[PDB]
Design an enzyme around this catalytic site. Structure first.
Site, mmCIF file in Angstrom:
data_model
loop_
_atom_site.group_PDB
_atom_site.id
_atom_site.type_symbol
_atom_site.label_atom_id
_atom_site.label_comp_id
_atom_site.label_asym_id
_atom_site.label_seq_id
_atom_site.Cartn_x
_atom_site.Cartn_y
_atom_site.Cartn_z
ATOM 1 N N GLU A 1 -3.855 13.382 1.684
ATOM 2 C CA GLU A 1 -5.122 12.889 2.243
ATOM 3 C C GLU A 1 -5.921 14.065 2.817
ATOM 4 O O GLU A 1 -7.039 14.358 2.359
ATOM 5 C CB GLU A 1 -4.799 11.818 3.281
ATOM 6 C CG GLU A 1 -4.043 10.650 2.673
ATOM 7 C CD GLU A 1 -4.386 9.359 3.332
ATOM 8 O OE1 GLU A 1 -4.088 9.221 4.550
ATOM 9 O OE2 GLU A 1 -4.946 8.477 2.653
ATOM 10 N N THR B 1 -6.565 6.130 8.157
ATOM 11 C CA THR B 1 -7.038 6.462 6.827
ATOM 12 C C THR B 1 -7.042 5.298 5.855
ATOM 13 O O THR B 1 -7.400 5.475 4.671
ATOM 14 C CB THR B 1 -6.286 7.635 6.207
ATOM 15 O OG1 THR B 1 -4.950 7.175 5.938
ATOM 16 C CG2 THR B 1 -6.284 8.867 7.066
ATOM 17 N N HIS C 1 5.174 6.786 7.207
ATOM 18 C CA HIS C 1 4.929 6.439 5.834
ATOM 19 C C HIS C 1 4.360 7.663 5.136
ATOM 20 O O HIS C 1 4.072 8.670 5.760
ATOM 21 C CB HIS C 1 3.951 5.245 5.704
ATOM 22 C CG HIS C 1 2.633 5.593 6.305
ATOM 23 N ND1 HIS C 1 2.367 5.457 7.644
ATOM 24 C CD2 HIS C 1 1.513 6.189 5.771
ATOM 25 C CE1 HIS C 1 1.143 5.962 7.892
ATOM 26 N NE2 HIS C 1 0.613 6.432 6.759
ATOM 27 N N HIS D 1 2.964 10.794 7.291
ATOM 28 C CA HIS D 1 2.315 10.437 8.556
ATOM 29 C C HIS D 1 3.325 9.821 9.493
ATOM 30 O O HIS D 1 3.851 8.727 9.213
ATOM 31 C CB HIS D 1 1.172 9.444 8.307
ATOM 32 C CG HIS D 1 0.000 10.064 7.602
ATOM 33 N ND1 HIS D 1 -0.972 9.337 6.954
ATOM 34 C CD2 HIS D 1 -0.284 11.383 7.471
ATOM 35 C CE1 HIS D 1 -1.826 10.208 6.437
ATOM 36 N NE2 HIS D 1 -1.452 11.464 6.765
ATOM 37 N N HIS E 1 1.639 9.081 1.716
ATOM 38 C CA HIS E 1 0.635 8.913 0.682
ATOM 39 C C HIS E 1 0.978 9.887 -0.430
ATOM 40 O O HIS E 1 1.398 11.024 -0.128
ATOM 41 C CB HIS E 1 -0.792 9.187 1.213
ATOM 42 C CG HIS E 1 -1.120 8.421 2.435
ATOM 43 N ND1 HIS E 1 -1.916 7.302 2.406
ATOM 44 C CD2 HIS E 1 -0.781 8.540 3.737
ATOM 45 C CE1 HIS E 1 -2.015 6.807 3.640
ATOM 46 N NE2 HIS E 1 -1.333 7.535 4.487
ATOM 47 N N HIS F 1 0.858 -1.214 0.000
ATOM 48 C CA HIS F 1 0.000 0.000 0.000
ATOM 49 C C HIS F 1 0.874 1.236 0.000
ATOM 50 O O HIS F 1 0.535 2.217 -0.680
ATOM 51 C CB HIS F 1 -0.984 -0.019 1.201
ATOM 52 C CG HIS F 1 -1.789 -1.267 1.327
ATOM 53 N ND1 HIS F 1 -2.761 -1.597 0.352
ATOM 54 C CD2 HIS F 1 -1.805 -2.261 2.228
ATOM 55 C CE1 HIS F 1 -3.381 -2.705 0.682
ATOM 56 N NE2 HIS F 1 -2.786 -3.170 1.821
HETATM 57 C C1 LIG Z 1 -4.068 1.154 9.001
HETATM 58 C C2 LIG Z 1 -3.151 2.261 9.452
HETATM 59 C C3 LIG Z 1 -2.134 2.013 10.342
HETATM 60 C C4 LIG Z 1 -1.274 2.955 10.784
HETATM 61 C C5 LIG Z 1 -0.183 2.627 11.785
HETATM 62 C C6 LIG Z 1 -1.404 4.260 10.314
HETATM 63 C C7 LIG Z 1 -2.411 4.594 9.428
HETATM 64 S S1 LIG Z 1 -2.633 6.259 8.879
HETATM 65 N N1 LIG Z 1 -2.585 6.276 7.270
HETATM 66 O O1 LIG Z 1 -3.953 6.638 9.335
HETATM 67 O O2 LIG Z 1 -1.508 6.987 9.425
HETATM 68 C C8 LIG Z 1 -3.290 3.570 8.977
HETATM 69 ZN ZN LIG Z 2 -1.139 7.368 6.502
#
Ligand SMILES: Cc1cc(C)cc(S(N)(=O)=O)c1
Ligand SMILES: [Zn+2]
Length: 258
Positions: free
Chosen positions: A104, A196, A92, A117, A94, A62
């Site tokens: 996002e 998200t 990570h 994030h 997006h 992803h």
């Molecule tokens: C499924 C999920 C896990 C983690 C640790 C972080 C997110 S996010 N994209 O909301 O930062 C999503």
């Molecule tokens: Zn994220």
């Protein structure tokens, strides 16, 4: 037929396996800057990454995750809107297929090229898996990316990506300092929301920085060479791995500044 970002398994389908997709505190959201109210009770964010210990970078099919050693009290987010202390576990991004999309969160409907994030879990719950079961379990620091000058502190991430092209690949990634990803100002907006991606759990205090970081076109182009598929499967470029803005419902977005 697992979730993803395609016509056939993307955001508009997630609610079938994950009903909370249509919940009361989903993320991301559009940040309408004129409606967000300055809250003089908010505190400066405290970001203490001086002892952060990265371990590994992972292509999870992803996005890619830069993982940290979260077994000691080191890289902590506190202050801001938070009660107590939150420990860094991973970051990570997006991003888009084009520079005109990829974030996002949006700001007065503006889409950034990407969004970082930095994910932290509340130490009062003992580990990440218990924290995500709580409404105040996580604090995610979101940072927008725009395309312009390169971000030098990003390059080590960019250069390892060739080695994790496909889903399920990982590479050792020690000694990476996430302070090199932060903008100058820690002014922020905050609101209660969710993860998200599936499972979309309503466990996040979002802290979104107002100041974007600049990355170069070459750096984001290398994000877009990653693959959602695994080795030996048809190539599907890892692009447009963002969820659109969701309804704000009965929430207020608060500003730390003005
Ligand atoms: C499924 C999920 C896990 C983690 C640790 C972080 C997110 S996010 N994209 O909301 O930062 C999503
Ligand atoms: Zn994220």
């Amino acid at each position: 037929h697992h979730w993803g970002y395609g016509k056939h398994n993307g955001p508009e389908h997630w609610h079938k396996d994950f009903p909370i997709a249509k919940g009361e505190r989903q993320s991301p959201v559009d940040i309408d800057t004129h409606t967000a109210k300055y809250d003089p009770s908010l505190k400066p964010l405290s970001v203490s990454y001086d002892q952060a210990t990265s371990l590994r970078i992972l292509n999870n099919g992803h996005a890619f995750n830069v993982e940290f050693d979260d077994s000691q009290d080191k890289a902590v987010l506190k202050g801001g809107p938070l009660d107590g202390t939150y420990r860094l576990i991973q970051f990570h991004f997006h991003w888009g297929s084009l520079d005109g999309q990829g974030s996002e969160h949006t700001v007065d409907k503006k889409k950034y090229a990407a969004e970082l994030h930095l994910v932290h879990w509340n130490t009062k719950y003992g580990d990440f898996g218990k924290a995500v079961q709580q409404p105040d379990g996580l604090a995610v620091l979101g940072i927008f990316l725009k395309v312009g000058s390169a971000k030098p502190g990003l390059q080590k991430v960019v250069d390892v990506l060739d080695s994790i092209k496909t889903k399920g690949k990982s590479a050792d990634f020690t000694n990476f300092d996430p302070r090199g990803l932060l903008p100058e100002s820690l002014d922020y907006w905050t609101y209660p929301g969710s993860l998200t991606t599936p499972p979309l759990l309503e466990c996040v205090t979002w802290i979104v920085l107002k100041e974007p970081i600049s990355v170069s076109s070459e750096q984001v182009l290398k994000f877009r060479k990653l693959n959602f598929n695994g080795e030996g499967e048809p190539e599907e470029l890892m692009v447009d791995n963002w969820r659109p803005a969701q309804p704000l419902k009965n929430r207020q977005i608060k500003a730390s500044f003005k």
